[PDB]
Amino acid sequence: NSVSVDLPGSMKVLVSKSSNADGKYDLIATVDALELSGTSDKNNGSGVLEGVKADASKVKLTISDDLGQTTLEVFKSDGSTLVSKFVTSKDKSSTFEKFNEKGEVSEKFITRADGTRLEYTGIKSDGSGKAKEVLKGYVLEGTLTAEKTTLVVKEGTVTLSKNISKSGEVSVELNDTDSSAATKKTAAWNSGTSTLTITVNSKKTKDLVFTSSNTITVQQYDSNGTSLEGSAVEITKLDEIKNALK
Numbered sequence: 001n002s003v004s005v006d007l008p009g010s011m012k013v014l015v016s017k018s019s020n021a022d023g024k025y026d027l028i029a030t031v032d033a034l035e036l037s038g039t040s041d042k043n044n045g046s047g048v049l050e051g052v053k054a055d056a057s058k059v060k061l062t063i064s065d066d067l068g069q070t071t072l073e074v075f076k077s078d079g080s081t082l083v084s085k086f087v088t089s090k091d092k093s094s095t096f097e098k099f100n101e102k103g104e105v106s107e108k109f110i111t112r113a114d115g116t117r118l119e120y121t122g123i124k125s126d127g128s129g130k131a132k133e134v135l136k137g138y139v140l141e142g143t144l145t146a147e148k149t150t151l152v153v154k155e156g157t158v159t160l161s162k163n164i165s166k167s168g169e170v171s172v173e174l175n176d177t178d179s180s181a182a183t184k185k186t187a188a189w190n191s192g193t194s195t196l197t198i199t200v201n202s203k204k205t206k207d208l209v210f211t212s213s214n215t216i217t218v219q220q221y222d223s224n225g226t227s228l229e230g231s232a233v234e235i236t237k238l239d240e241i242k243n244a245l246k
Contacts, residue, residue, distance in 0.1 A: 002028070005045030007063060008070045009088035013045045029061060031072060036061050057083065076103075089113075116214045118164070120144050133162075135214055137236040153238065155245035158185050162210070170210050172196045174245075185245065198244070199225070206244055207232075218244050 002014040016026040027038045027049050036059060040047030049061045056077035063070055072086040081103040088094040091113045098107040104125070110118040116135050123129035127146035132139055140162065142151035149164040157178040163171045174187035174196065187198045196208045203225030209217045209232060217232035218240075235241055 002026075003045075005067070007045065007067060008090050008092075009086075009094070011061075011070055011088075013049070013063060015040075015043060015045045019043070031059070031061060034059055112214065114214060118149070120149075133164075138238045138241075140238075153241050153245065155242040158245045160241065160245055170194060172208070172210060174198065208244060216241065 001017060003017055005013050005015055007013060011031065012029065014028045019025050024039045024041055025043050025047075027040055027045070027047055029036045029049050031051075034051045034053060036049035036051040038047055038049035038061075042065065044067060046063045046065045046067060049063075051059045053059060053074075058075040058077065058079040060073045060075065061070060062073075068090045070086075070088050072088075074083045074085075075081055076083060081101075082097075082099040083103075084099065085097045086094060092111075092115075093113040094111045096109045096111075097105050100106045106123050108120040108123065110120075112118075117133070119132045119134065121130045121132075123144070127144070129144040131142045131144045131149050131151060133142075133151050140151035140153065142149065142162075148166075151162040151164070153160040153162075156176075158174060158176045161173050161175075163173070165171075171191060172187075172189055174185060176185040178184040182201055185198055185200055187196050189196050194210045194212075196210070197204055198206045198208070203223075204221045205225065206221065207219045207228065209219075211217065216235040218235060219228050219232040220230065221227060222229050235244070
């Protein structure tokens, strides 16, 4: 009769085993206790399913042609003003967006494949908002502008800024307002190694590596400031970032 097809986000869609006189396949799924239905000219479980809630809100599930992504939209009763959208990928990454009354994004929660999160709240029409990055062991706080996301850690007169572009590219900078050259921190970012090298009084002191696993490691230099010693150690809490900035 039907074939159950496994989709991202542990969702399932039933597809008819064979096509009708028009060559089309029937699709059925149950999402959040609502039965959705649709038809497709493909036999693999891809296509669009729709349902209508008790309250007249319209639900639409779109399964991409290669089954790599699901988009689950809830609309107002007009079928066009978004209330929410979940987009889930095969790799386990996802996005959840909430919309305001004009159907424009007001909150956006990104879950990466590794389970870390980037959370945008209080999003305004000017593109600004509040940002929080949820990592293994700790969270970073900052802001969103149209230009970029900037997460900030302050320690004494030092400010560490972790910038994330719209496409997820990380760059990091440091500024210290310390008026003494004996203690003022400066830093160089190397985009090629995702590493921030801190210097104090003309001696390199530490490398902070911002890894592809969304972690930070720290490693110290020798007293002459030209050779790394020991091994890189993973930072496990915000206070350990602050320690590296002292």
